[PDB]
From a paper:
The human ubiquitin ligase HUWE1 (also known as ARF-BP1, MULE, LASU1, or HECTH9) regulates the stability of diverse cellular substrates and, in consequence, numerous physiological processes, including DNA replication and damage repair, cell proliferation and differentiation, and apoptosis. HUWE1 belongs to the HECT (Homologous to E6AP C-Terminus)-family of ubiquitin ligases (E3 enzymes). The HECT domain consists of two lobes, a smaller C-terminal ‘C’-lobe and a larger ‘N’-lobe that are connected by a flexible linker.
Along with secondary structure predictions, these analyses led to the identification of a stable HUWE1 construct (residues 3951–4374) comprising the catalytic HECT domain and a previously uncharacterized 42-residue extension that readily crystallized. In molecule A, the C-terminal part of the extension (residues 3979–3990) that directly flanks the HECT domain, folds into an α-helix that we will refer to as the ‘thumb helix’. In contrast, the same region adopts a turn followed by short 310-helical segments in molecule B. The N-terminal part of the extension consists of a long amphipathic α-helix spanning 21 (3951–3971) and 22 (3951–3972) residues in molecules A and B, respectively, that we will term the ‘pointer helix’. Interestingly, the pointer helix of molecule A points away from the HECT domain and contacts molecule B, where its hydrophobic helix face is grasped tightly by the thumb, the pointer helix, and part of the C-lobe of molecule B. As illustrated by an open-book view of the dimer interface and a contact schematic, the extensive hydrophobic contact network stretches all along the thumb and pointer helices of both molecules and includes Phe 3955, Phe 3958, Ala 3959, His 3962, Val 3965, Leu 3966, Ile 3969, Val 3984, Leu 3985, Tyr 3988, and Val 3991. Remarkably, the C-lobe of molecule B is conformationally locked at the dimer interface, where it buttresses the N-terminal part of the pointer helix of molecule A. Our crystal structure of HUWE1 has the C-tail of molecule B fully resolved. −4 Phe is buried at the dimer interface, where it interacts with Phe 3955, Phe 3958, and the aliphatic side chain portion of Lys 3954 of molecule A in trans, and with Leu 4335 and Leu 4362 of the C-lobe in cis. In contrast, we have discovered that the catalytic activity of HUWE1 is down-regulated by dimerization, as mediated by a previously uncharacterized region adjacent to the catalytic HECT domain.
Author numbering:
A (entry chain A): 3936 to 3941, 3947 to 4014, 4015A, 4016 to 4372
B (entry chain B): 3950 to 4170, 4173 to 4190, 4198 to 4374
The structure:
């Protein structure tokens, strides 16, 4: 099933056997049933699957998912909706269904409309739902201030009296689309995909959600705590459901003072709280609906960048269009680092190109009107590359709210490609 | 070339998988990689060694092991140990030995047991017992002495020594027993290749290389060879065309190697396999079995580099810089496999690499340039401690090729 990449005389037959054993081993591990495995031993197997290419992991994902369908008697299931009320009608029709029922084959029927191809109607239906779930009138999701086209949970969702039930429904629909192997135009924030994967956010995630709070954190990290006229404690204010409250980051955080040894830890904890604190119940509802269909441990083989690609698909990126609409600061278009950069980017496969777009823009969503219409925090903001004048042993940094790449003056092409390629991959949970 | 991309993938796959299996606190069958037990032959040495010792403990778990005394004389350890242990049962041999030297001070039993194993391993090879003899080519490696029949009770002794080697493995205690590569193949039930003769009968090997490379009409000369078993000479039938040569060379080499010692081996293997199941030991290669019994050596590469000779190559040749870079990048097991590949053993000479011994006396490690096409592996000739190294185009290619050459077993590039 799974495929691997690709001497004279007696050595050729020796190599082909060597080559076949390696493939046999890989395939046997990936074909092996994992349903006897607990979460601990399964996570160990994930440390191996995680290193494989995206398409291999997607293929393993779909294999294991179908294995979870054993013991099910799948039926065709009708979803009756009105073209004017698709979202609320679909909620009524599906939100009380069981998880097992949701694995049935949906066929949509619009009230009193001419019978069309069921397959296309399902595609049409998904398209409408993915759009309406982000409609402000339901107050479930809101755009991030930084990246504009990405969404996360609206903390003021309690205006809608049924929101918790609706968040569970929306989580169910996202999982159902993945299950049905149908793409959605739902583009969430990087941090939101982390929530699904059960990963903590970094302070860098704050930049596109709450810009000024992010800056305060960077200042705290880069300077001594004594340079502040105020003291800090392991506690922060959170406004859940319109009710403000001071929650402790760690067990006695209100009496614990923020020292230099505590800074990195403080920043880590406070960001987690601010990001998920005002939305913890809406999020828990969403994840309940999601994990009902797609187990958490199973989706955890993907990285936050890849999960988006799983849900929304792999895009085709017109690099010429991007290059035509790139601005340069300190660098010029003909600077050696820039020529290397474009050569490196073109040398990336489809997945890594997408991961790069995610890395600098905050999403894999390509603007319909081309990269001349790339949106940022302050309006239309073209992709821009700045020279990083610090030492050349750091990775390229990004600031997605400006669609900005900070590129050090690397000494060689081999170094630039290697460093850039590392930067676009998943980051660690390290506090620094 | 697409082949090098595959080798690059394969090493990544090797490194990742094995590293996970090393951190594992589970048995391999109980864990998530349980499917691999059927492909245990392909994993790294230490991983197979962990599996080996775990499986060994699991199969005897139903046994109630007690402490067992062995009474010997410090001056007569070998023959006394034969008396105390050679008629004992396999289950008795799986008990915990504690040694008592006749009329000597009671010491730490763990330390005293390590001293008893080191002394018996040195005495197995004493010519006075006429059980083993050194190979002419590699000098420091041993195999069965065909003239073992001088003592008529020898088959009983071959079984005893086989038992002691296995017992040492069972007890997880290392021995200073260094056999020939061919001998380890015998333990694993593997056939020898014509290349193996080079260190056993140099002149015969030359005849075989000539026969293989040239036409049969260039000789002037049947599936039979002379064997001197038990001092009694005989021409034994193996089963001579150009089409049959492949077959002829294979059979005759088997015969010259195993013909005069076939019963002595069967006795040794009987003794060995009583303690250690054959299927379990067969997960190792001929190279690896030695490392299991004798341990992984630590190699001072600086000492080796200081005593390396170069022919056609110079010390500053780019392939030589790559070579040392490749060797340094190898883990302990692969470094050992390299030492085995070019010298014929993993035993580091006590007097340093400046005293490396060869067929015709003292011979330092030497690297020659192989001027033939660069699509072949590095070749070795262990009786000269010689590495034949092609002028490889890149470091990545040289390293990949060297790694394949030192891991090669008689079943190909790693066991099939």
């Amino acid at each position: 099933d799974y495929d691997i990449p690709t001497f004279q005389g007696a050595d050729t037959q020796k190599f082909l056997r060597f080559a076949e054993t390696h493939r046999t081993v890989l395939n046997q591990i990936l074909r092996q049933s994992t349903t006897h495995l607990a979460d601990g031993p399964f996570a160990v197997l994930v440390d191996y699957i995680r290193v494989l290419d995206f398409d291999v992991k997607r293929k393993y994902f779909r294999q294991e998912l179908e294995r979870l369908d054993e013991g099910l008697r799948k039926e065709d299931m009708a979803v009756h909706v009105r073209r004017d009320h698709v979202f609320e009608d679909s909620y009524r029709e599906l939100h009380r269904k069981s998880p097992e029922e949701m694995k049935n084959r949906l066929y949509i029927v619009f009230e009193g409309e001419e019978g069309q191809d069921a397959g296309g109607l399902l595609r049409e239906w998904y398209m409408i739902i993915s759009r309406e779930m982000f409609n402000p009138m339901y107050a479930l999701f809101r755009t991030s201030p930084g990246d504009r086209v990405t969404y996360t949970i609206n903390p003021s969702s309690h205006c809608n009296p049924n929101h918790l039930s609706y968040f569970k429904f929306v989580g169910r629909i996202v999982a159902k689309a993945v299950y049905d192997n149908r793409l959605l135009e739902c583009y969430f924030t990087r941090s939101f995909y982390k929530h699904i994967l059960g990963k903590s956010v970094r302070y860098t995630d704050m930049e596109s959600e709450d810009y000024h709070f992010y800056q305060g954190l960077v200042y705290l990290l880069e300077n001594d705590v004594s340079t502040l006229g105020y003291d800090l404690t392991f506690s922060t204010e959170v406004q859940e459901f319109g009710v403000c409250e001071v929650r402790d980051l760690k067990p006695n955080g209100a009496n614990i003072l923020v020292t230099e040894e505590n800074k990195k830890e403080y920043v880590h904890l406070v960001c987690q709280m601010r990001m998920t604190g005002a939305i913890r119940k809406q999020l828990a509802a969403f994840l309940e609906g999601f994990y009902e269909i797609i187990p958490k441990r199973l989706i955890s083989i993907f990285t936050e960048q890849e999960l988006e690609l799983l849900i929304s698909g792999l895009p085709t990126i017109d690099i010429d269009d991007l290059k035509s609409n790139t601005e340069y600061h300190k660098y010029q278009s003909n600077s050696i680092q820039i020529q290397w950069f474009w050569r490196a980017l073109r040398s990336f496969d489809q997945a890594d190109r997408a991961k790069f777009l995610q890395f600098v823009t905050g999403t894999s969503k390509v603007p319909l009107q081309g990269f001349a219409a790339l949106e940022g925090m302050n309006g239309i903001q073209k992709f821009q590359i700045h020279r990083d004048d610090r030492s050349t042993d750091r990775l390229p940094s990004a600031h997605t709210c400006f669609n900005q790449l900070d590129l050090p003056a690397y000494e060689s092409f081999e170094k630039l490609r290697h460093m850039l390629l590392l930067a676009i991959q998943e980051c660690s949970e390290g506090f620094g």
